[PDB]
Structure 1
Amino acid sequence: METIAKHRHARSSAQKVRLVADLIRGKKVSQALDILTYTNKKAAVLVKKVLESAIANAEHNDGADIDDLKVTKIFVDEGPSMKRIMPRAKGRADRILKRTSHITVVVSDR
């Protein structure tokens, strides 16, 4: 794999995390923070972690020390959603799907 990292579960819904992801693409890499470290939404704290793990895989699976790179890809997918119940009007309006995603960050060449 051209240095990835991705995720799975944890729980943070799709769209929720899909929002912060758009913030980072193209340049990225050297943007391991700032364009992320200066935005607080749970989704952000999650993409950064895996962001670093990914950029870290640049010293193991492949060479090219952290400084170049690009991050030409970032997309979140819907991950199995947990189910639960919710006491309400005798039991009619209750479904609650926790939802969850990943991130799947990438870092190739420009």
Structure 2
Amino acid sequence: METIAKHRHARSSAQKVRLVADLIRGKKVSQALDILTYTNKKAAVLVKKVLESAIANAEHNDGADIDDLKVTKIFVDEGPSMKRIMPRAKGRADRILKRTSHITVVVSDR
């Protein structure tokens, strides 16, 4: 079967997170975990936590064979944007959008 784990409203930008997410697409669990551990990115650690949660869900809810898992479908999208006001010269203001990333990882031994 397929086990899905997601992180919603993450404190990172979807564009930046995809840069590290694309690496662990179509790769085995052990190599993906090693790459995420040795990759120095906030998005890297976020996706590491997401994949760890996915693996734990597979081990608990589903039957067995942790080793034979794989990253079948990993995708990250943009979510709610927090609007903030930043002063500038001449008394003007700029609207800055702090972005959040919804990350989803689906694994399946089959």
Do the aligned partners of residues 78 and 25 (structure 1) sit closer, same or farther apart at CA in structure 2, a change above 3 Å counting? Answer: same
Shift of residue 93, structure 1, vs aligned partner: 5.1
Conservation of the 8 A alpha-carbon contact between 1:81 and 1:99: yes
Give TM-score, length-normalised by structure 1.
0.89
Conservation of the 8 A alpha-carbon contact between 1:54 and 1:106: yes
In terms of fraction of residues, the more helix-rich structure is 2
Conservation of the 8 A alpha-carbon contact between 2:85 and 2:93: no
Structure 1 gap segments, 5+ residues each: none
Shift of residue 91, structure 1, vs aligned partner: 4.4
In terms of fraction of residues, the more strand-rich structure is 2
Do the aligned partners of residues 91 and 65 (structure 1) sit closer, same or farther apart at CA in structure 2, a change above 3 Å counting? Answer: farther
Shift of residue 59, structure 1, vs aligned partner: 1.8
- Superposition RMSD in Å: 1.7
* Paired residue secondary structure (2:99): coil
- 1:7-26 residue pairs with structure 2 within 5 A? 7-26=7-26
Give the number of aligned pairs: 110
Conservation of the 8 A alpha-carbon contact between 1:26 and 1:70: yes
- Looking at structure 2, the residues matched to 91 and 46 of structure 1 have their Cα atoms a distance apart, in angstroms, of 38
- Looking at structure 2, the residues matched to 91 and 108 of structure 1 have their Cα atoms a distance apart, in angstroms, of 55
* Paired residue secondary structure (2:53): helix
Moved over 4 A (4+): none
Conservation of the 8 A alpha-carbon contact between 1:21 and 1:47: yes
- Percent identity between the two aligned chains: 100
- Looking at structure 1, the residues matched to 4 and 47 of structure 2 have their Cα atoms a distance apart, in angstroms, of 12
Conservation of the 8 A alpha-carbon contact between 2:85 and 2:94: yes
Structure 2 gap segments, 5+ residues each: none
Give TM-score, length-normalised by structure 2.
0.89
Do the aligned partners of residues 96 and 3 (structure 1) sit closer, same or farther apart at CA in structure 2, a change above 3 Å counting? Answer: same
State the match for 2:72 in structure 1: 72
